[PDB]
From a paper:
[name] is the archetypal protein tyrosine phosphatase, playing a key role in cellular regulation, cell-growth signaling and signal transduction by removing phosphate groups from phosphorylated tyrosine residues. Because active-site inhibitors of [name] suffer from bioavailability and selectivity limitations, notwithstanding some progress in bypassing such limitations, there has been an increasing focus on the potential of allosteric inhibition. However, to date none have been clinically approved, illustrating the persistent need to elucidate conformational ensembles and allosteric mechanisms in this protein. RT crystallography can reveal alternate protein conformations, which can interact with one another to imbue proteins with allosteric properties.
Here, a recently introduced serial sample-support chip system has been used to obtain the first [name] structure of a human phosphatase, specifically protein tyrosine phosphatase 1B ([name]) in the unliganded (apo) state. In this approach, a vacuum source in a humid chamber is used to load microcrystals onto a chip, which has a base that is compatible with standard goniometers at synchrotron beamlines. We use two different processing pipelines and obtain very similar results with both, demonstrating the robustness of processing data from the [name] chips used here. In previous apo room-temperature structures, the active site and allosteric sites adopted alternate conformations, including open and closed conformations of the active-site WPD loop and of a distal allosteric site. By contrast, in our [name] structure the active site is best fitted with a single conformation, but the distal allosteric site is best fitted with alternate conformations. This observation argues for additional nuance in interpreting the nature of allosteric coupling in this protein. As may be expected, our model is broadly similar to the dozens of ligand-bound cryo structures and the smaller set of RT structures in different conditions. However, despite its moderate resolution relative to past single-crystal structures, our data set also indicates a degree of allosteric decoupling that adds nuance to the previously reported paradigm of allostery in this protein. No serial crystallography structures of [name], nor indeed, to our knowledge, of any human phosphatase, are yet available.
Residue numbers in the entry: 1 to 284
Amino acid sequence: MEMEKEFEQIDKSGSWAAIYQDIRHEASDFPSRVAKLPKNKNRNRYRDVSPFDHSRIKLHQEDNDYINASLIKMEEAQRSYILTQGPLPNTVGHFWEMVWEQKSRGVVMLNRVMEKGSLKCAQYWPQKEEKEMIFEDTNLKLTLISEDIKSYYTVRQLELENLTTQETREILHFHYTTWPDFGVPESPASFLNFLFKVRESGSLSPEHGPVVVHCSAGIGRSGTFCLADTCLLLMDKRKDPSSVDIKKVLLEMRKFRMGLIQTADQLRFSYLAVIEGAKFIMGD
């Protein structure tokens, strides 16, 4: 592992903030005209986190097709992700319309509904089996089937029914619940174990639609997920834990959504998780 001694080299030199700035500067920049139309102002959670028009997800609704969401297509790894913001009270129906239209099998949530005294996300899934949710604007019903609460994540089977065709699908909600309010987790082990549960569920398999991933803005903790999954997969395809340049992967993902990886602590954590997750992918 080169990166393991490049990692040790960057900590010594304390220069995480420097590399992270390098990436901010090299990062690509494309139009996001649709996002900043005023008809869409209230469809965005942060005024400065916009999907690029080229990689954006379109709702199949000729009235307004906008939702703040990007398709990240990683060609060498054969892995696609949909990165999105946490739904607004007025976009919850859109969010499930998107999960329906894209044929996604799983949703990964990396935030709690309330963080730092504020609401980072609408409550967009049901809490009790018997209290189903109806989305009138998008003709969808959502039902909680089961719920498996563990120490640092919760998994939920949900049933999504299309009212106007009577088709149903089962969605897996993977909810990481212990991401620190400030900073990043002290060890990646929790995060890695959550990652592998998502993998084992099949939600990433390419017979399915792309997994929907989000946090508050869909770039910070969301990117850490995607970057770690993809780096670890490329280490497999090459079965060589050192042809993978984590900064080069990051810059390629940022062609598809701006700002992935928000802090330089997140970047360090990204390295830390890939290095550690490499143990259990090189035979173990």
